[model samples]
Target: APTAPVASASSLMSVGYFNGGGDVTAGPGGDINKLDVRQITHLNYSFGLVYNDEKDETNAALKDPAKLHQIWLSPKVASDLALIPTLRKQNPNLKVLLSVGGWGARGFSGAAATQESRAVFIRSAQEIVEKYGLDGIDLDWEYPVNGAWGLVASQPADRDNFTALLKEMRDAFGHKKLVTIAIGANAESPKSWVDVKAIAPLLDYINLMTYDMAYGTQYFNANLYDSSAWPTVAAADKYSVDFVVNNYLAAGLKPQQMNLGIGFYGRVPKRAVEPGIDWTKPDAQKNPATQPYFGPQEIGLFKSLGYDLTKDTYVKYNDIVKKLLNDPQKRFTEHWDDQAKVPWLSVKGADGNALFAISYENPRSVAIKADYIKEKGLAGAMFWEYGADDENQLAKQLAASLGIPHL
Candidate 1:
C-alpha cells in the first residue's frame, strides 16, 4: 500500500471537489488543464449531467481527469448502463456512482410526499450504488425543505425526515463507500430553504452550489464569476464565496465540511443599450425577444449583430443576443460588482440594442477564487458543467494552481 504522505493533519482531510454531470461535454474526457485536480481533497463525480438513456452519451464520456473515474449516474435516465472498460483500464482508481434526484427531480419533496416511495427510491439507489462499485452516492436534491423546483411542497416536518433518509442510506451502505449530497448556497437566516443545520451533520461533506447568480433566464444581470464586492475585495461576488461560506456556517456547517461550487459554463446575457440608457431607457436597449445569448430559446450562430455568448455575460443572453445580432463586436467593457464578486457588461449594438452578460469562471477567475477558498478556510471548490470550460487551457490552469492532478 502507498504510505500516507507525511503532512499536517489539515492535509489529511483535503480532497478535490468537481461536479461532472453537466449536459454539455459531448466527449468523455474533458480538458485536463481546466480540471487540475491533483491537489484537491475530493473530486465530485458529475452525476446529474446524465438526463436519460436517450441522452446517455455522458456514460461514454467517463474518462477520468484525476484517475478517479468514480462518477455519479442518476437513476431516472441510466438504469441499465454499461461502462467503458477502456477508461477503467487506463485508470483503475476510477469509481462509478449513482446519483438520485437533481435540480428538476424535487428529490426530497418526493421523499416527504410519500414514505414508501422514498424508501423504494432509497433502496433502489443504494442497490445501484453498490452494484457499480461507486465510491459513493451524491444527492443533488436542490432544496430539500424549500425550493422553487415546483416538484417540492411546503412542509416544516421535512426538515428532520430528510436527515432521516440520509441516515438510513448511511446505515444501509455501512462500509460500502461514501454518501454525500450537493447543497444550495443559500444565505437566508434560519436556513429557511434547506435545513442544512439539521442535514449537514449526517453526511461526509455537503457539495454546496455557490453559483447561478443571474443565469438561466432571470430578470436582471449579474457577474457569472467574481467581482470586487463587499466584505471581500473581489471585483464581483455574484455567487459570493463569502455568501456560501457564511451560509454553511449559519447552517451549522464547518468551513472544512463545505465545498464551494463554480460554474464552468458561461451565463451570456443579451442587451446593447444607448449610452446612458439603462433598463428604464425606452428603445435605448433592445428587447430580449430580439436579442438572445444563453439558456433555452437562445439564438445560436445567428448573425443579428446583437448579443454574443462569450465566456462572460452568459447570465443574460437573450437581450444581448439581439444586440450581437444587430451589432456583433459592439464596443463593450466588463463592470465589476463587488457585492457579487462578478463582472458584467452591457454594449450597444449598431442597430440599437443592449447586450449584457456575466462571464463564467475562466482560468484567471478560477485562480482568484481558489485564493478565496484558502482565505475563507473552505473545504474546496466544485464546478458545474465541466465540459463548457476551455478544455485545454483554463481548466489546466485551475488544475495546476489548485494543485489538483488531472488525469
Candidate 2:
C-alpha cells in the first residue's frame, strides 16, 4: 500500500515571475513596488532579450544607457526598474534574476549557434549583472529544437548547443551569482532536448513551466496531473505536475534544483460544455457549438451560427474571480476535480443557456500544489506573472503553504 509522502521543511523557495511592462503602470499608481517582495524567496524579472546580433543588444537593457530610454518611455516599466534597490532593501534575502528570452524573443538560436555568438551573449549578460548589481540571470528559451510562437526554426544541433550555452553561462557567472532557466514541464519530448544530467550541476535551479500544457487545445490550461487525455505524441505521456516531477527525477535532476510552476492565470477554452454534459453526445447540450466543439465540422458549424470564435482563450485568475466567481449576476457554478486537484467554473447565460467552462487555480488549488511541492521535496514553487494576482490572494496561499508568515 502506498503511504503518504513526508513533506520536507528543509529548504522551501517561492519564486514569482514579474512581467516588466505589464507590472508597470501608466503613471504612479502601479509598478514593481506594489509587489510584496517577502512573499517570494526569488523574483524573476522578465524579459531580458537579445533581439539583434549586436554585442550590446544581449542580456536585456542594463548595459546600454540608451536602451533605458525605451523602457523608461513607459513610465511604469521605468518606475519598476528603479525600484530593484528598494526591493532588495525590503527583503535582503530575495534572489533577483533577470530572465532573458520569452515567447517571441528571437535570436536565441543564432546566439547559441556558435561560440562567437555565444561569447557575445555571455559577455553582454555579465555586463548586465555588473551594471545592475543583479543577483543572477535566467534563460527563458522556449525550446531547444522546437521554436515556439513561430519565431525561429531551431536546428537538430540546438539540443547539444543548449547544453553548451548553459555550461558557458555557468562559467561566465561562476559561483558569485545564480544561474537558472524557465523550462517546459513536459518530459516526453523536451526531456530529450534538455541534457538534465549534463546541465544539472551548473544550474542553481530549474523553473519548470508546468502550466500552459493545453495551449491551442480545448482543455485545462494548467492541469496539475491529469484533467483530460493528452494528445498523441512521441511519449504520449500525460504531462502534469506529478508526471513532470517524476520524469525529471528519473532523468537525474535533484529535487532541490527543481521549482514547480504555479499558473496564476487560467486557460479559457475556445469551446466548452456544461461541467456534467457529455461532450461526445451532441444533443446533450443546447447548441452543438458549445459541446466541446472540435475541429472542422463542429467548429465550422459554430462559425456559421454567428459565434465569435476568434476571441482569445486566456484569462487571468483575478479577472476570472471578479468576472464570474464573485459576480452574483454571472452565477457561475464552481466545481473541484478531486483527481486533477483544480477548480473549474461553469457559466450560464442570463437566459439559462450554458456559456463556457473555465479551469483555474484559486487559493484552494494553489494550497494543494503547495502541499504537493513540500511533499515531493522539490526546490519550491514559482508562478508566471506576479501581476496576474492583483489581489495577492493566491500569493498569500502559496506563501502560507511554504510556511511563510502573514502578508
Candidate 3:
C-alpha cells in the first residue's frame, strides 16, 4: 500500500449542493429529513436563476427580449428555500449559499452586460440572502463565453464582463460573507470563459466542476488522475481532476481557493448496443470502437447500435447502490482504475462479452479523493445535488477519509 504524506490541517470545507428533489417539501437525498447537515460545512441550494420578472420570456419571438431583471426561484425551489433556517438548526457550522444558474438557466449575459444590470441583480441577490439568512452566493453561470447548451447568450465581451460580475459580488458582499463561483473543469474552451487570474481573489473560493469527464464509457465521471499509461484510460488523457487543478492553478488560483467538485451521479448507456461493440478500440468510438467515428457518408452519419452518446442516462449513486451494486444478482463487480484513482464496473453478457461500462464513484473513491485533497493542499471537496447519495454513504465516508479534525 502506498502511504500518503501527512499534511497539516485547516478548515477544509465539505460543500454539498442541495436540490429539494421532485418533492420540494422533502428534506433531500431520497427521503424526508435525510440530508445530513453535520457532514457538510457548506450547503449550496441549487438554482436561484439570473432572471427577468417584469416580462416572462416564453420565447424571444413573443416576449420582450428578457431583462437581467433579478434572481428568480421556481415555486418548488422556493418552498425548500424557506426551510433553510430549519436546516440551519441541524449544523451550526453549515453555510447555506443560494447557487444561481444551472445548465439551462439563463439571463447571466444580460445581468453582466452593464453596471445598472449588475446593480439590479446584486440587489435582488442580497435581498434574498438577508431574507433567507443565506451565508453566501455560488455563481454557477455554466459558461460566459461558450453556449454549449444553446441556452446561454454570449459574445467576446463576456470574458471581461464575467470578471466584473465577480468583482461586483465581492465588493457588495465584502469579506464577511462567501462569494464563490462554480467553474467548469472541461478542457474544451481552454479557459476562454473567464479572466481567472483577475477574478481569483474576488471570490472566497472557486468550485471546480471536475465531474462529467465524458458522456458514456468514454471516461470517468470524475477522476483524480489520468494515468493514461493504462489502456482504457488512454482515451481519456487530459480529462482528470489533477489536470483541472493544474490548469486553474496556472490560470492563477491558489490551491486553497479551489474546492474540488464531485458528481453524486454517473452516466450509463440507455440501452444495449448491437453485438460486436467494444469501447476499447478505435480502428475508431461512441460512434463504434471499430468503424470510423462518423458512420457511412450518410448525411449526418446517424447510424448507431444502442451506444447512444447523446442520451447517456444519468444514474444516481443511490440507484447504482440499490438497483445494481447491492442486488443479490451479483453480476456487477467493480474494478479500480489505479491510474485514474476511481471505480469502473464492467458488465458481461450471457456470452461473457462486456455489455456496458459503469463509470461511477463509491465510498472508496470518495475517500481516496479526500486524501488527494489533503495531499494536494486544495481548499476542500464539494458534490452536486446531495440527494443522490446512497443513505448518506458517500458523505459519511468522506468525513472519515478527510478526518473530523480537518472538516
Whose TM-score is greatest here?
3
For all predicted structures, in order, the TM-scores are: 0.64, 0.78, 0.81
Model 1, span 359-400: residue lDDT tens: 445455666666667777777666554345443344455556
Per-residue lDDT of 137 in model 3:
91
Q: Cα lDDT for residue 371, model 3? A: 92
Q: Residue 276's C-alpha lDDT in candidate 3?
A: 24
In terms of TM-score, how similar is model 1 to the real structure? 0.64
Over 4 Å off, model 1? 1-81, 84-96, 112-115, 149-154, 215-239, 268-345, 350-355, 405-407
Least well predicted 10-residue stretch by lDDT in candidate 1: 229-238
lDDT for each candidate structure: 0.49, 0.69, 0.70
How far off is model 3, as Cα RMSD? Answer: 7.0
lDDT of 1: 0.49
* Cα lDDT over the full model 2: 0.69
Return the lDDT, model 2, position 311. 39
